[PDB]
Structure of Chymase:
Amino acid sequence: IIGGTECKPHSRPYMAYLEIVTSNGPSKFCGGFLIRRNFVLTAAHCAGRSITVTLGAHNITEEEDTWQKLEVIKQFRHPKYNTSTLHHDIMLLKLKEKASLTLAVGTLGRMCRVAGWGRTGVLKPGSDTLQEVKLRLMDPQACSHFRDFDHNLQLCVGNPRKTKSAFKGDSGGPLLCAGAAQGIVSYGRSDAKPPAVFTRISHYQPWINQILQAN
Ligand SMILES: COc1ccc(-n2nc(C(=O)O)c(=O)n(Cc3cccc(C(F)(F)F)c3)c2=O)cc1OC
Ligand SMILES: *[C@@H]1O[C@H](CO)[C@@H](O)[C@H](O)[C@H]1NC(C)=O
Ligand SMILES: *[C@@H]1O[C@H](CO)[C@@H](O)[C@H](O)[C@H]1NC(C)=O
Ligand SMILES: [Zn+2]
């Protein structure tokens, strides 16, 4: 998160930290959010060979009792996910067990909020601590330069006049507007000039519900 503030610890109890393992490279990192005790929503580009989820985290380097490190048994990438366009950048992860409900872990032009452990700047490393920022929801013409952006599929997020933005490592995390999850962090520019592209959750709700009811 660029230009945000450190969260009050455990104030966003649905937030999930994803370590993503591939066969030909070192660990990758994503965000995500708990919508059932055994399901986490995130972005499809965060898929890999295997994934471990950490709930209850704030400072991701300092292990504490709030932590629940949970195995992912199955990844459900949208069947129409496109790795070039990032169309339909949404994925469900089924946890091996139901997480415990605690204080620190629970299920989940207007201003919206997004949080994550991602980079704090173009050359800055990933944040140790959960960070959050307020961003403006923009009319779709603001994201026109992203040639494969589509207003029905995706939100345009982040005033281009400001620095504030989600950035690398913040992928998969929720965009909350007035307390409700509206988007998922998908992609933006390398230089981190906003706006950024987020998955529009509303369009995918029937698909989300199909996956939950079969699993
Ligand atoms: C479909 O089209 C695209 C797909 C991917 C990327 N793209 N490219 C990057 C690069 O290194 O070139 C890069 O770093 N990021 C990460 C990134 C940059 C800014 C904001 C975010 C966040 F969290 F979404 F908000 C992520 C990225 O998504 C860019 C595209 O279109 C130019
Ligand atoms: C997070 O914890 C690590 C290890 O104690 C420390 O290096 C880092 O400074 C901490 N960051 C905070 C509390 O912002
Ligand atoms: C992904 O998108 C490109 C560009 O529109 C399309 O031509 C390509 O065949 C797609 N790939 C899949 C497997 O969806
Ligand atoms: Zn704590």
Observations:
- The pocket of zinc ion (ligand 4) is lined by residues 9-10, 58, 64, 66 (CB under 6 Å).
